[PDB]
């Protein structure tokens, strides 16, 4: 960011600031379970308001609505309520992000107005592909032109979304496009932590986003010495390598095609892969599912999903943590939100905290994965908790993030 415009250098007095933030907070029963991401944007929002901004217009995605409006399930209205108490100022929530009324509402606001727009991904044009459909070029441009109308200057503080070349992150057309203080803070910490990692350097890759994150491993394999592939990531690997019965467990069809290549590469680079060997199983995807056990040998019965690892998996995971002097962890190794399926991420968290206390550099990142830290009160018991998960895995790969690359130059 050493040659991008940042917010400390952007005169905002009398200007309308349009700001990309990652307010993609975890939700349950329609309430926010962790305001980490909203809090982390506050310093940039306060700075703008403290420095004479006419308005701050805030925009984000929440979830993966895939280009269909879904106020029911993926509305940002709750974030607007939480943002009020953290700023101690009112937030005008708007029920759309583009179009004549959003434009009217943001055209010339009272001085100091903060406005939050609705979920960008209710419009196919943010990503723009969705549902199955490709966005139309003319309409992407139109959607991008609408968003650009809402401020005089642009700030991108959406670190957690920086890996995404979506319309709101890279397509806003204003003379001045500044990185915010959170983007700044996360990029510096990682440029430090990734410069000369302590070794063995372990990556711990779990979660639910298999299609996307399975595609990151190839470049990661050039950087790390060990890799835990757990959570929802494990089942593509285990079907291919062990012909394991997997049931309704998460599976990536594309990912499975390259699994043999990534294992060949892991070997060629001396990167030790630790995959799970037992499981807690579910009869459906529900907190109060009937539950069971399987090993890789037994397989998982048709009709059932693996939603946590078992105790023998926890033991292997612990051994990898014990050998590490640096850890980057994105993705829980089970569905930690539900207690029937939380023991394995809780045990792995326990290892990671014990590892930190004897000098291991521990870095946990992501919306859901940082919520592990909140839930077990380990936020100050590891080295760094980042608002980015995927964004951080893409910095580990050695990429310039598209949301950083689209910023103005000095
Ligand atoms: N089979 C499964 N299905 C759903 N979630 C699973 C899972 N296995 C583990 N998880 C856990 O993964 C969590 C999603 O994590 P992600 O968004 O991929 O990574 P990030 O938020 O960047 O750190 C989800 O909440 C569940 O607890
Ligand atoms: F859900 Al992520 F980084 F993939 F927070
Ligand atoms: Cl995905
Ligand atoms: Mg997540």
Residue 90, φ and ψ in degrees, nearest 5: -70, 150
In angstroms and rounded to an integer, the radius of gyration of the C-alpha atoms of the chain is 22
Q: How far apart are CA 334 and CA 309, in angstroms?
A: 7
Q: How far apart are CA 16 and CA 114, in angstroms?
A: 10
Closest to 376 measured CA to CA, from 337, 341, 326? 337
In the block, tokens 């207690």 appear at 339
- Provide the 3-class DSSP secondary structure of residue 29: coil
Is 64 labelled as part of a ligand binding site? yes
Residue 113, φ and ψ in degrees, nearest 5: -70, 125
Q: Are residues 104 and 209 in the same domain?
A: no
Distance of CA 172 to the CA centre of its chain: 21
Q: Are residues 114 and 250 in the same domain?
A: no
Is residue 352 within 8 Å of residue 202, measured between CB atoms? no
Q: How far apart are CA 107 and CA 87, in angstroms?
A: 23
Closest to 207 measured CA to CA, from 26, 35, 359, 37? 26
Q: Are residues 360 and 310 in the same domain?
A: yes
| Paired tokens of 243 | 């012909």
Is residue 318 within 8 Å of residue 351, measured between CB atoms? yes
Closest to 371 measured CA to CA, from 346, 396, 344, 397? 346
For position 73, which CATH number holds?
3.40.50.1260
Distance 211 CA to ligand 1 centre (A): 12
Q: How far apart are CA 125 and CA 128, in angstroms?
A: 4
Catalytic position from the list 130, 367, 388, 403 = 367
Buried (b) or exposed (e) across 45-58, using 16+ Cβ within 10 A?
bbbbbeeebbbbbb
407 in a domain, yes or no?
no
In the block, tokens 């069971």 appear at 292
Q: How far apart are CA 320 and CA 167, in angstroms?
A: 40
- Asked whether 67 lines ligand 1 (CB < 6 A), one says no
- Asked whether 281 lines ligand 1 (CB < 6 A), one says no
3-state secondary structure 69-110: CCHHHHCCHHHHHHHHHHHCCCCEECCCCCCHHHHHHHHCCC
Q: How far apart are CA 121 and CA 203, in angstroms?
A: 30
Q: How far apart are CA 294 and CA 297, in angstroms?
A: 8
Q: Where are the alpha helices (DSSP H) in 196-310?
A: 210-213, 217-220, 234-242, 253-268
Q: Are residues 156 and 200 in the same domain?
A: no
Catalytic position from the list 4, 16, 184, 209 = 209
| H-run or E-run covering 16 | strand 16-20
Q: Ligand 2 pocket test: which of 214, 216, 233, 330 has the largest number of ligand atoms within 8 Å of its C-beta?
A: 330
| Paired tokens of 375 | 């839930």
Q: Are residues 206 and 319 in the same domain?
A: yes
Q: Are residues 288 and 319 in the same domain?
A: yes
User: Domain end: 128, 161, 182, which one?
Assistant: 182
Q: How far apart are CA 49 and CA 113, in angstroms?
A: 8
Contacts of 88 (CB under 8 A, 6+ apart): none
Contacts of 328 (CB under 8 A, 6+ apart): 201, 202, 203, 204, 363, 365, 392, 393, 396
Is residue 203 within 8 Å of residue 224, measured between CB atoms? yes
- Annotation marks residue 84 as catalytic: no
- Provide the 3-class DSSP secondary structure of residue 228: strand
Q: How far apart are CA 329 and CA 350, in angstroms?
A: 13
- Provide the 3-class DSSP secondary structure of residue 231: helix
Q: Are residues 153 and 258 in the same domain?
A: no
Order across the sheet with 226-229: list the strands.
272-274, 226-229, 201-205, 326-330, 361-365, 384-386
- For helices 42-50 and 181-195, the axis angle rounded to 10 degrees is 140
Distance 64 CA to ligand 1 centre (A): 13
Query: % helix / strand / coil in the chain, to the nearest 5?
Result: 40, 20, 40
Q: How far apart are CA 35 and CA 378, in angstroms?
A: 16
- Annotation marks residue 209 as catalytic: yes
Closest to 120 measured CA to CA, from 183, 66, 56? 66
User: Domain end: 136, 160, 182, which one?
Assistant: 182
Is residue 279 within 8 Å of residue 306, measured between CB atoms? yes
| H-run or E-run covering 292 | strand 291-295
Local structure of residue 305 (DSSP, 8 states) = E
Is residue 349 within 8 Å of residue 320, measured between CB atoms? no
Q: Are residues 178 and 124 in the same domain?
A: yes
Positive or negative, the Cα torsion across 152, 156, 158, 163?
positive
Distance 33 CA to ligand 1 centre (A): 14
126 in a domain, yes or no?
yes
Q: Where are the alpha helices (DSSP H) in 124-222?
A: 124-127, 137-148, 167-170, 181-195, 210-213, 217-220
Note down the domain range covering 42.
1-182
Nearest ligand, CA 365: 1
Is residue 333 within 8 Å of residue 397, measured between CB atoms? no
Q: How many structural domains does the chain have?
A: 2
- Provide the 3-class DSSP secondary structure of residue 361: strand
Local structure of residue 213 (DSSP, 8 states) = H
Which atom from ligand 1 is nearest to the alpha carbon of 213? 18
Is residue 360 within 8 Å of residue 396, measured between CB atoms? no
Q: How far apart are CA 326 and CA 42, in angstroms?
A: 30
121 in a domain, yes or no?
yes
- Provide the 3-class DSSP secondary structure of residue 295: strand
Distance of CA 239 to the CA centre of its chain: 26
Closest to 190 measured CA to CA, from 362, 396, 35? 396
């Amino acid at each position: 960011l050493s040659n991008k415009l940042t917010l400390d250098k952007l005169d905002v007095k009398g200007k309308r600031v349009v700001m990309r933030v990652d307010f993609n907070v975890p939700m349950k029963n329609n309430q926010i379970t962790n305001n980490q991401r909203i809090k982390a944007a506050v310093p940039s929002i306060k700075f703008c308001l403290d420095n004479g901004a006419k308005s701050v217009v805030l925009m984000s995605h929440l979830g993966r609505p895939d280009g269909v409006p879904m106020p029911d399930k993926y509305s940002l209205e709750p974030v607007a309520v939480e943002l009020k108490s953290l700023l101690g100022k009112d937030v005008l929530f708007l029920k759309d992000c583009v179009g004549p009324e959003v434009e009217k509402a943001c055209a010339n606001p009272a001085a100091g107005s903060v406005i939050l727009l609705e979920n960008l991904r209710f419009h196919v044009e943010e990503e723009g592909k969705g549902k199955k459909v490709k966005a139309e070029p003319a309409k992407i441009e139109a959607f991008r032109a609408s968003l650009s109308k809402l401020g005089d200057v642009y700030v991108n503080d959406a670190f957690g979304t920086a890996h995404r070349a979506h319309s709101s992150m890279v397509g806003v057309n204003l003379p001045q496009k500044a990185g915010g203080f959170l983007m700044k803070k996360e990029l510096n910490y990682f440029a430090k932590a990734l410069e000369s990692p302590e070794r063995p350097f372990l990556a711990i890759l779990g979660g639910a986003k298999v299609a996307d994150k399975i595609q990151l491993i190839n470049n990661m394999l050039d950087k790390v010495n060990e890799m835990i592939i757990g959570g929802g990531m494990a089942f593509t690997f285990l079907k291919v390598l062990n012909n394991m019965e997997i049931g309704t467990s998460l599976f990536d069809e594309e990912g499975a095609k390259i699994v043999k290549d990534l294992m060949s590469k892991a070997e060629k680079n001396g990167v030790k892969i630790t995959l799970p060997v037992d499981f807690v199983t579910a009869d459906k995807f529900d907190e109060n599912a009937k539950t069971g056990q399987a090993t890789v040998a037994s397989g998982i019965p048709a009709g059932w999903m693996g939603l946590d690892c078992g105790p023998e998996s926890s033991k292997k995971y612990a051994e990898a943590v014990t050998r590490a002097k640096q850890i980057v962890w994105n993705g829980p190794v089970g569905v930690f939100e539900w207690e029937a399926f939380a023991r394995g991420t809780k045990a792995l968290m326990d290892e990671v905290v014990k590892a930190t206390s004897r000098g291991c550099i521990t870095i946990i990142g992501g919306g859901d994965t940082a919520t592990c830290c909140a839930k077990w009160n380990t936020e100050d018991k590891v080295s760094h908790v980042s608002t980015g998960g995927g964004a951080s895995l893409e910095l580990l790969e050695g990429k310039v993030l598209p949301g950083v690359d689209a910023l103005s130059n000095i």
